[PDB]
């Protein structure tokens, strides 16, 4: 954030984030000469990339989505087309845009609150009445569909434990609570999402019954 008049002369993203104060604190904000960090969230105002910028801690505590198409075509794509072309021809632009094309077809994500009360078939994604995990046409193949995804729960369990005990060694103590919300540590907010991945993947396997009793 440099001198304020050159950034008066033309609208930028970081200047817009800095000059927009917060409701919590109009006494801690970027000044002249420092660096402003931001990420770009997804919206439908395509004329302006200065209308989609947000503080990293604010998108942390308020959980706004990310514009994967912005990061795909505006951040990544053109440096790669600088580097990868001179070794080959223009079939190399088509090779990386086709290596995108085999891999672009896999995406993951008022009225939106009135959902749930049923879940889609784990095999073929068909919404249906009742809580059972398998579909009646894909009911036979179920031992393989249980086998699949318990090796995913197994790998999320292994990632929870390596992270939440690293904070205990970076903190010093093994007997008291961790309080470190250090925004420059990758440890923070990577220890926050595995709790939710595990929360979700544990509940998907309770679609299947229990492997035994527990009150004996």
């Amino acid at each position: 954030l440099t001198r304020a008049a050159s950034d008066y002369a033309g609208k930028q993203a970081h200047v817009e984030l800095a000059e927009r104060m917060r409701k919590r604190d109009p006494g801690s904000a970027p000044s002249l000469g420092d660096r402003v960090p931001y990420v770009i969230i997804s919206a439908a105002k395509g004329v302006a990339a200065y209308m989609k910028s947000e503080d990293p801690l604010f998108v942390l505590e308020h959980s706004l989505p990310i514009d994967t198409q912005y990061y795909l075509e505006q951040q990544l794509a053109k440096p790669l087309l600088r580097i990868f072309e001179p070794i080959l021809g223009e079939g190399r632009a088509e090779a990386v845009l086709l290596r995108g094309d085999h891999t672009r077809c896999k995406t993951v994500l008022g009225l939106l609150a009135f959902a749930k009360r049923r879940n889609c078939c784990i095999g073929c994604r068909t919404v249906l009445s009742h809580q059972g995990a398998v579909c009646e046409f894909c009911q036979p193949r179920e031992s393989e569909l249980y086998q699949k995804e318990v090796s995913h729960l197994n790998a999320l369990e292994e990632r929870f434990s390596r992270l939440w005990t690293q904070c205990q060694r970076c903190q010093g103590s093994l007997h008291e609570d961790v309080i470190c919300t250090s925004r420059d540590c990758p440890i923070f907010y990577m220890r926050k999402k595995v709790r939710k991945d595990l929360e979700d993947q544990e509940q998907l396997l309770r679609r299947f019954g229990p492997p035994g009793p527990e009150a004996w």
Binding site: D34, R35, P37, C170, S182, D184, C185
Partner: peptide, 16 residues
Amino acid sequence: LRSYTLNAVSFHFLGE
């Protein structure tokens, strides 16, 4: 550098 916080320069030069 990229960030000028005490945590960032202490990691960049020492290692927290």
